[PDB]
Design a protein around this ligand. Sequence first.
Ligand SMILES: Nc1nc2c(ncn2[C@@H]2O[C@H](COP(=O)(O)O)[C@@H](O)[C@H]2O)c(=O)[nH]1
Ligand SMILES: Nc1nc2c(ncn2[C@@H]2O[C@H](COP(=O)(O)O)[C@@H](O)[C@H]2O)c(=O)[nH]1
Ligand code: ALF
Ligand code: ALF
Ligand SMILES: [Mg+2]
Ligand SMILES: [Mg+2]
Lengths: 290, 288
Amino acid sequence: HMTGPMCLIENTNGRLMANPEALKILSAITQPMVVVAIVGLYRTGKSYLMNKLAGKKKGFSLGSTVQSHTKGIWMWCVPHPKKPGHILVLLDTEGLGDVEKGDNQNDSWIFALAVLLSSTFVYNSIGTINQQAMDQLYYVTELTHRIRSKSSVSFFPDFVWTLRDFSLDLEADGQPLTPDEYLTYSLKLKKGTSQKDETFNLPRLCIRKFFPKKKCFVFDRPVHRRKLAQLEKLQDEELDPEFVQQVADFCSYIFSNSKTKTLSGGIQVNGPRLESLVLTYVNAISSGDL
Amino acid sequence: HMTGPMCLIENTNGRLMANPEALKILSAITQPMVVVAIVGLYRTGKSYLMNKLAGKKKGFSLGSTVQSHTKGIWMWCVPHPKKPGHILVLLDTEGLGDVEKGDNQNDSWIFALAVLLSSTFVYNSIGTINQQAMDQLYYVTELTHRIRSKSVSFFPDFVWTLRDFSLDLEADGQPLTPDEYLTYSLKLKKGTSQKDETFNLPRLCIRKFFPKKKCFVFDRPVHRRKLAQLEKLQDEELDPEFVQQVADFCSYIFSNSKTKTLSGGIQVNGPRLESLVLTYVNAISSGD
Ligand SMILES: Nc1nc2c(ncn2[C@@H]2O[C@H](COP(=O)(O)O)[C@@H](O)[C@H]2O)c(=O)[nH]1
Ligand SMILES: Nc1nc2c(ncn2[C@@H]2O[C@H](COP(=O)(O)O)[C@@H](O)[C@H]2O)c(=O)[nH]1
Ligand code: ALF
Ligand code: ALF
Ligand SMILES: [Mg+2]
Ligand SMILES: [Mg+2]
């Protein structure tokens, strides 16, 4: 049916535009949708992980260069491998912090759309969880509220942090951590009444409230090789064997746990209803708030 | 001289303070100084690369876990390996973006001090040059002017060190040296629209602020899944290319990094560095 990805939201010269051809395809799919979007800094292996969710070696194209490759937001609608009669919709995004673009405002919009359109939202980083990403997640979360206002049980997405090229010991304060406990460690509140105790707390309170469920997975370097240039065409046997497992566990969690996308009121989102969200939210951005 | 590093600027509960023991060591050193500082996100291999400048296996301690390890600003004064009668002062810094700390303002001060105190400033990142790193570098150079106001260029030279570098050095069909990658990342936009001007203004300020720039790439130090034992490994246990890239970095620092200088052209020795540390730490500890 849908034989490869297609640009859903174009990103050309500062302007975010819905692709009519993608909208057409969406308007033909009447099945309910599980929507999994991924965002993170550019050149962090996002497109590759998304191809795993499709069960394919190739799909969203990777790019082997210091330049950004994924632009705007791409979609790939494929049969949901565990829930009969559902469609799994994969949303692959333009990486954050491209120095060729140099446009933060534009980053925020893409980030925001990804959150607004998803039922599972995947934030992808290398090595560590880091405050600057947590600051940005919080900002975009709040912006998401302003966009919903401009038009106008929970229908906010569940949350996954994917840690790439993970090489450090999962320990803190003498104590081992699971990946999940590392995430909740990172969102832990300062006990104090004190003032700054409150500045520190407040973003964390907001992220914890916005995303109802949370999950964290670590991934080894895919390959031992010093270069990733040939990745698209290496079979599992040529990859690091614990990377392969880690990817399986991740996919299997997404397949088992990611909920059907839902409108406020509880109505389930299918093609025509996603098409109508895309336009609503792109129009709301094309206007003028920040 | 110094058998190991020590804390120069402590960082406790939002307070940055000079270590009197460190100042006392500074005040005894009459020789002119080359000062190399390193900044970047936390857990990014900063302390390891600094130890290679000191030609020791162990030194600034690394730490194995997800938690930050280097706190505040540490110093290591060793004889300059290429300039007789000079001292090489290495400043290793608390990494940025620590989720345990969750204090951007503290990050800034540490970032500003490193810039203010150095004669070569090394900014260290994984994989790419990110715009978020550029944005903060701009922010901090401006802050720097503010701090200097509370009380022939003497601004440091600049080096971007790219870690775990795995991507093809190539942009728009054309192959890049690391240096051409840095200058590509600071390229200005043709036109003169509002948003051309916004894009340009950070890039103009960085390029003006740092007289010389330079860029190195480093492979992953090891192939092993985990970094844990990395204090202990010899050069033949490491990635061969990483060893050569480090040799090349070090030999660039040794050859090219200038003596630290005050405005008016006076060369900074221990007592003059001491007085800079106090001056800048007090200005931060006062009220903006
Ligand atoms: N460092 C790293 N790069 C990866 C990984 N997976 C794929 N890549 C590379 O990341 C690039 C795509 O990243 P994206 O811009 O989609 O975030 C491609 O070069 C792809 O080969 C990974 O696990 N770690
Ligand atoms: N990913 C990565 N980590 C490294 C590298 N060199 C050393 N490390 C690790 O980086 C951590 C220290 O980083 P720092 O907090 O000083 O920036 C230690 O765990 C050290 O073993 C490197 O080249 N790449
Ligand atoms: F750099 Al990309 F998707 F190619 F973030
Ligand atoms: F996490 Al560090 F120096 F130990 F930035
Ligand atoms: Mg991509
Ligand atoms: Mg360190």
